[PDB]
């Protein structure tokens, strides 16, 4: 097993001299066009406001609120810090990508398709679950023609376990042949499920 | 972007009553790769396969947490103890797989759009608390700086069973609850 690197260590804030208080930091590797380009971001949050951020396309910290301004100015004063941070996009970000690619970028889990008459029967439900990645095409055909008019889809829903699901319902009083067609990257050919 | 790998960490505390919490996690697009148990210095992979593919030295997260803890106190001072309104969660309840009688399934309770990220789920079947096999996720962020959280209940669908998921958010006057029954 190879070891992932930290995407970042939070910078230290400068002190400028019931209750609840929150401090968050987020370090983001954005992988654009596959491996072509990386954009690296830092974000520093206090309660529900982003105070200051770093964008490698800019190369400097930028304050989003006045509370972040002393912090951006402080960190931007440290030339070696900015050099090291500027190195993360093509450094740790790409190191982590190389380890992760085979099971994240390239993760592939097949959808499971059930077609179900609902009520007599005034609706056909095409339930599609368990798939990864979240991009999917689910369409209804009646007698050969795709139906757009009377189709109601949920959003694609995150299950939180690295699978997704979607339900696509056709409002129809049973044409003669209904088919739910599912296209997904995990599959060599689409799944066509006809209703009994 | 096209894919995002995100290291997300936070440190937070309440006064009256006094309590503190912290979190460190790696995330890929909307999903979680791992978090670190910050009392135990343990890397906890979201799916077991991930720990057969990669490793992560957990104490790094704890060292980052100490930085975040110091930053919290500094920003509380710099802001003159600035605070913000709580937002209570909305809830969705749905099965992970197509429902079949007598076929093991998992019910998913998704709490969304809440702040701060302190919230517990409680599951009931036909009004009785159920705990065995429940899995609760850590808190996942959102671009609007609210949070979300998943809980999972393994179950076997039977006609007439009614499930409920209730979420207790820090500071809320009561739980928010939703119910679900297999069709």
Author numbering:
A (entry chain B): 6 to 22, 39 to 140, 146 to 200, 203 to 224
B (entry chain A): 4 to 186
Can I see the authors' text?
The classical class I and class II molecules of the major histocompatibility complex (MHC) play crucial roles in resistance to infection and response to vaccines, binding peptides for presentation to thymus-derived (T) lymphocytes of the adaptive immune system as well as natural killer (NK) cells of the innate immune system. In contrast to humans and other typical mammals, the level of resistance to many infectious pathogens in chickens can be strongly determined by the MHC (that is, the BF-BL region of the B locus), at least in part because the chicken MHC is much simpler, with single dominantly expressed class I and class II loci. Virtually, all of the variation responsible for allelic polymorphism and thus for different peptide-binding specificities in different chicken class II molecules is located in the β1 domain of the β chain, encoded by either the BLB1 or BLB2 gene. We expressed BL2*02 linked to several Marek’s disease virus (MDV) peptides and determined one X-ray crystal structure, showing how a single small amino acid in the binding site causes a crinkle in the peptide, leading to a core binding peptide of 10 amino acids, compared to the 9 amino acids in all other reported class II molecules.
